[PDB]
Amino acid sequence: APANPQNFNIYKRIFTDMVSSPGTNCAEAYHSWADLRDVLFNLCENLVKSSEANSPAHEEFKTMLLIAHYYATRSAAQSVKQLETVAARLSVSLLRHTQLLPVDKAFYEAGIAAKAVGWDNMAFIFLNRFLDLTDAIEEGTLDGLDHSDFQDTDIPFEVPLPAKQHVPEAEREEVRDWVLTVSMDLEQVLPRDERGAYEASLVAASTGVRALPCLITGYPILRNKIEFKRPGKAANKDNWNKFLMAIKTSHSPVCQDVLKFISQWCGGLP
């Protein structure tokens, strides 16, 4: 029994528990995500001071912080109608972090959000993958999966297989019905951007330059980059403006909280 003076184990465990907890894909979950975000920020604030910065534990906690920020910003976006697409893109981008998230949950959420904003190709691909992952959970192996759908993406293929199914059976079976019906026709490929890469992918498989992920949607910044004082922190000016406009028109406290955090974390508005 050794001591953990910096509490790495505690914070990692609460991150893990939180992202596998139920009922977290709604606006009402904002404060639980923001809280996780905030404690992780404070932790990273202490790592740099304590000079254990840039050890793989510091960097993995930075990644966990980024993930908690995506989730909190997602709940904020779910609070007002005019940010629906933002919320949807956040669950799409979270698919790249499924080495750290229950992967069935992640694909379920990406697929449902995509479907609700009318992105039916992505909805079909993500929800089919979700069904395959629920079966693989039941079977106990991942060797049944076909990774052809995501072969030139930053979506990881080797991921932890969850021991339990995150999504209740009724929701699984509604997804199963819909996927079966749609399967009877749509083009089932993920959309590509001007790079010839999957639009949500930070790595352009073609070129090989890693794009920065937008702080608002998670998507690769391809144009109109605006940079924050902290290095490596950028947003697409159009996403930025969309979020600021939603604050201007709605006075959303959870969106203003998101804005406050981005300013504190990246060192002032860009």
Residues that bind Cl ion (CB under 5 A): 4, 6, 8
Between 8 and 41, whose beta carbon lies closer to Cl ion?
8
Question: Judged by CB, which is closer to Cl ion: 4, or 181?
Answer: 4
Nearest approach, Cβ of residue 61 and Cl ion (Å):
11
- Separation between Cα atoms, residue 60 and residue 166, nearest integer Å: 24
Place of tokens 């749509």: 186
Query: Nearer to Cl ion by C-beta: 4 or 51?
Result: 4
170, burial (CB in 10 Å: exposed 0-12, middle 13-18, buried 19+): exposed
| Residue 215 Cα to chain centre, angstroms | 11
H or E segment to which residue 248 belongs: helix 237-250
The DSSP call for residue 227 is E
- Can you tell me the distance from the alpha carbon of 178 to that of 3, in angstroms, rounded to the nearest whole number? 51
| Residues composing the chain | 270
* Closest approach of Cl ion to the CB of residue 8, in Å: 4
- Minimum CB–partner distance for residue 101 and Cl ion (Å): 23
Beta carbon of residue 34, minimum distance to Cl ion (angstroms, whole number): 24
Q: How far is the CB of 232 from Cl ion (least distance, A)?
A: 25
End-to-end CA separation in angstroms for the chain: 46
The residue at minimum Cβ distance from Cl ion is 4
Helix (H) or strand (E) holding 51: none
What span, in angstroms and rounded, lies between the C-alpha atoms of 100 and 19?
9
Q: Which is nearer to Cl ion, 8 or 261 (CB)?
A: 8
How far apart are the C-alpha atoms of 179 and 188, rounded to whole Å?
12
Q: Which is nearer to Cl ion, 57 or 179 (CB)?
A: 57
- In the bound complex, what is the minimum distance in angstroms from residue 7's beta carbon to Cl ion? 6
Rank residues 6 and 165 by Cβ distance to Cl ion and give the closer one: 6
Contacts of 61 (CB under 8 A, 6+ apart): 8, 11, 12, 40, 43, 44, 47
Task: Tell me how far, at minimum, the Cβ of 13 lies from Cl ion, in Å.
Answer: 12
User: For the CA atoms of 74, 76, 78, 83, what is the dihedral angle to 10 degrees?
Assistant: -90
Nearer to Cl ion, 6 or 85 (CB): 6
| Helix boundaries (H) for 25-168 | 30-50, 56-78, 84-93, 103-116, 120-139
Quick one: 46 or 249, whose CB is closer to Cl ion? Answer: 46
Shortest separation between residue 12's beta carbon and Cl ion, angstroms: 10
Q: Shortest CA distance to 159 belongs to which of 186, 185, 129?
A: 129
